[PDB]
Ligand binder design. Structure first.
Ligand SMILES: CCCCCCCCCCC(CCCCCCCCCC)(CO[C@@H]1O[C@H](CO)[C@@H](O[C@H]2O[C@H](CO)[C@@H](O)[C@H](O)[C@H]2O)[C@H](O)[C@H]1O)CO[C@@H]1O[C@H](CO)[C@@H](O[C@H]2O[C@H](CO)[C@@H](O)[C@H](O)[C@H]2O)[C@H](O)[C@H]1O
Ligand SMILES: CCCCCCCCCCC(CCCCCCCCCC)(CO[C@@H]1O[C@H](CO)[C@@H](O[C@H]2O[C@H](CO)[C@@H](O)[C@H](O)[C@H]2O)[C@H](O)[C@H]1O)CO[C@@H]1O[C@H](CO)[C@@H](O[C@H]2O[C@H](CO)[C@@H](O)[C@H](O)[C@H]2O)[C@H](O)[C@H]1O
Ligand SMILES: [Zn+2]
Ligand SMILES: [Zn+2]
Ligand SMILES: [Zn+2]
Ligand SMILES: [Zn+2]
Ligand SMILES: [Zn+2]
Lengths: 307, 307
């Protein structure tokens, strides 16, 4: 019996309720911070504060996408969505990356327009006050996280947020005391936007690899092929497909050409057990064929060449 | 021998060279049209001409994505991309939709800013000349396409382009003779942007359905399940997965629980032939299991409920 070795846990686990509560609290806090920073930066006509608020918007969007994916990954698979709704997490990550690129591009264009035909005034007091408030808020968030895995990830993320806020505060301090240095705002916007795009590049690469039906990063083609070929009875392998619904949901398929004096049920059971134990594939479908002498002659029955 | 029934055609077909040439010519013509219209609209400070140029940019991006996908869908499958590069077409369609949304949103914001605090001047002569040039170019393109499938699709697309250009020309004519009606430009921008978003919605829906690993639109769950269950020997079915790499590349997988007094090779061959003939699946992997009495009791061995 395929898929009968494990069991599906129904209902909502108590730890998942805690995770949902933490995500709700983090989303509320980050949204309040983003709204306050947007108001302050608009009052100060500052673009660095726009960059910080855009980063907070990216954080909020990522957490909201995570919450939406968590809610979606509980409905049963339908007749139109056979695999379930696990791809929603990847789609939400892609949406967050795209939105970050949009806002960063808008901010970069605004900063570039500011730099040449430098016609803008920046309120030093308002910008300094907003930057100080943002730095204090980041420090308070870091202290709360230290007092209270996901918490450690939030702690390091808040430390990075705090470093960026310190940079913005330094720029605001420079502008406030020396009003002639208004150019520190577009320059800081440029630096932080480039940093944001560089930070978002790896997630975009991973999302694209998942979406293009590529092999999962951790799972290797050669280890899986060698595991399948090591099963007693298997002679060859073709049409070995490995892809991931998300970072944790991996699917596998293959055609196994077994010997004539082999038991297809035993081969199938052993191969499924080996794949599940070694690689933890959520789904695995193996087509047990018979190794005809013509199998080793078909062009399409040949594995991809070594990289 | 599963997958040995068809044959793979190598090289480049003569008709594909012609298709590439047509795509190159169309991209060149649309890019020249877009550049001319951008120059004219910028000279005229018009936003309707920006909307038409944005539509031309969307057309150019879609054709360029099609060309890139056509070039990519010739490399052999690697060890990191087992299925090939067919998902590139869907990714390019999604990218074109996202870019269209970006430009449309920018134009909509500009038009909204124009409408309230109406501080802008529109050169009637330049806008009228650009609109007349665009209408004449669309008419010439339609005539050329009529003189010379893909050509008919281009013809109807150019007819729609020509209708939009006629609307822009009517707005320009109204503005030129009556300069007090500058509001006709933001209003036209709004109408055409809403039309563009409404037109782009269905493609976004289809792309999302493909990317979320959903069932292909044409292929139905029940017909495939009934085809599989009609094979002499099959007693049940579970883990039936149907999804599409693109609009034309469909993949299928299933676990077949056959009778004890059945031949797995014959069942597999018959099921593969039936699926290929009826639905034309590019890839098909079927796991032929043995129908234990406990199969009809497992929760995970049950098909999704009827919609
Ligand atoms: C009492 C209440 C407690 C609530 C706790 C809530 C915790 C849940 C949210 C935690 C959170 C948001 C923080 C929001 C602000 C803080 C909240 C403010 C609260 C104020 C009260 C922190 O996520 C941060 O993400 C960064 C990048 O996003 C990452 O940094 C990175 O670069 C660094 C460069 O130096 C480097 O050092 C570091 O190693 C890198 O990983 C940080 O390490 C990580 O901390 C995001 O949670 C999750 O974290 C995952 C880790 O990756 C993140 O990535 C996953 O998916 C990726 C693709 O899907 C995939 O690519 C990843 O492999 C995968 O893992 C998830 O997407 C995200 O959902
Ligand atoms: C001598 C040189 C000849 C060169 C010929 C080049 C031909 C190749 C390009 C032709 C082309 C660009 C035209 C560019 C400007 C014209 C060129 C100017 C040349 C000047 C010399 C015309 O594509 C147009 O696309 C429109 C929507 O995009 C579509 O309209 C639609 O709504 C109408 C609402 O009323 C309605 O009526 C109509 O029924 C609808 O379909 C039009 O019917 C269709 O004509 C696009 O080609 C292909 O067309 C496919 C058809 O759909 C299009 O969709 C495919 O994929 C979709 C998701 O991937 C999926 O959703 C579709 O199901 C699928 O089919 C492809 O994406 C595209 O790649
Ligand atoms: Zn942050
Ligand atoms: Zn073969
Ligand atoms: Zn067009
Ligand atoms: Zn099965
Ligand atoms: Zn079962």
């Amino acid at each position: 019996h395929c898929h009968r070795d494990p069991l599906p846990p129904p209902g909502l686990t108590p730890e998942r309720l805690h995770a949902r509560r933490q995500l709700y609290a983090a989303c509320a806090v980050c949204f309040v911070f983003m709204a306050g920073e947007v108001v302050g930066g608009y009052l100060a006509h500052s673009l660095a504060i726009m960059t910080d608020a855009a980063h907070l918007l990216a954080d909020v969007g990522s957490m909201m996408g995570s919450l939406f994916s968590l809610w979606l990954s509980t409905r049963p698979a339908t007749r139109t969505m056979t695999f379930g709704w696990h791809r929603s997490e990847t789609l939400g990550a892609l949406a967050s990356v795209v939105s970050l690129w949009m806002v960063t591009g808008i901010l970069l264009y605004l900063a570039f327009v500011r730099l040449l035909h430098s016609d803008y005034h920046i309120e030093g007091g308002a910008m300094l006050l907003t930057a100080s408030i943002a730095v204090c808020a980041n420090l308070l968030m870091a202290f709360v996280l230290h007092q209270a895995t996901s918490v450690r990830a939030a702690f390091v993320h808040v430390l990075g947020d705090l470093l960026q806020s310190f940079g913005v505060l330094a720029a605001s301090i420079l502008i406030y005391f020396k009003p002639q240095y208004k150019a520190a705002d577009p320059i800081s916007t440029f630096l932080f936007s480039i940093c944001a795009l560089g930070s978002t590049a790896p997630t975009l690469r991973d999302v694209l690899r998942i979406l293009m039906e590529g092999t999962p990063r951790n799972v290797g083609f050669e280890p899986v092929r060698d595991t399948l070929l090591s099963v007693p009875g298997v002679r060859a392998t073709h049409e070995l497909h490995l892809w991931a619904l998300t970072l944790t949901y991996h699917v596998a398929s293959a055609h196994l050409a077994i010997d004539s004096t082999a038991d297809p049920e035993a081969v199938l059971a052993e191969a499924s057990s080996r794949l599940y134990s070694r690689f933890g594939f959520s789904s695995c479908t193996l087509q047990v064929e018979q190794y005809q002498p013509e199998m080793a002659q078909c062009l399409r029955c040949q594995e991809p060449p070594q990289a």
